[PDB]
Structures are given as structure tokens and as C-alpha cells.
Amino acid sequence: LLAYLACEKENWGPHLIVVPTSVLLNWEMEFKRFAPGFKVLTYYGSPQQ
DNA sequence: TGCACAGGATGTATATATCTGACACGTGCCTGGAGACTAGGGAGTAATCCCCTTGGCGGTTAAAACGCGGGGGACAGCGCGTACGTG
Predict the structure, then answer these.
(1) Nucleotides of strand B under 7 angstroms from a protein beta carbon
(2) Which nucleotide is closest to A46, CA to C1'?
(3) Inter-CA distances, A36 with A31, A45, A46, Å
């Protein structure tokens, strides 16, 4: 659906997912596996990183 | 002539009468001791409601705890001289 929004319209936008802490890496690995052309960030190291 | 002696001329602690100072006793007018009336402030109670607990599982995060390197600062040793101790 997010890859459909990039090709259907010109809206890309900064998106947001809310994942549990155990499946945090599977969405990044799935984002590199499926639909590579998206820029994805993650969230680790709350006080410093 | 050199020498001991008897009595006076001054001292000196000793005992006695005398001068302050503080403890002890005998009063009386501003205090207390006590009797009665008032009453409002203190002792007692009936809901109340409201924030304050009761007990313990996990997940995760930010704070607390440990560990080593070493660098610079506490700290000991020692000579000087002038600044207060002593007369």
C-alpha cells in the first residue's frame, strides 16, 4: 500500500509505524527485502542515539 | 691594757579592745485566699467523603554501581630570615 502511494500519486510523505519491540527489526529487514526504494529510519538508544 | 658584765634603747610577735558587714528576727498594707453568679467555650457524637492503599506478575528504560589509567595535586623534608617572644 505504501509503495502504491508512491506510484499512484506524488505523495510520499514521512510515514510512521508503531511496532512492538520484538518485531522492530523484521520491518526493517522486510523493508530492505520488499520495496527497497524507500528511505527507512529506526529508533534505538533513547538518551543518546 | 684586754675583757666580761649589768643595765638601758630600741623591736616584735603576742593578746586585747574596736570597727564594718552580713545573718537573723519582729512588723503591717498591698498582695493573696476564698464564696457565689453567669455562659460561652470546651467535651462528645453522627454521618461523610475523599484521597489513599493492597499484592504481584511481565517489559523496558534511565539511573545507580563497578573498574581501570594516570595526572596532577595533597603531602613529607628541609633551609631561611625576620618577626614577634622575652627581658
Answers:
(1) 59-63
(2) B61
(3) 6, 25, 26
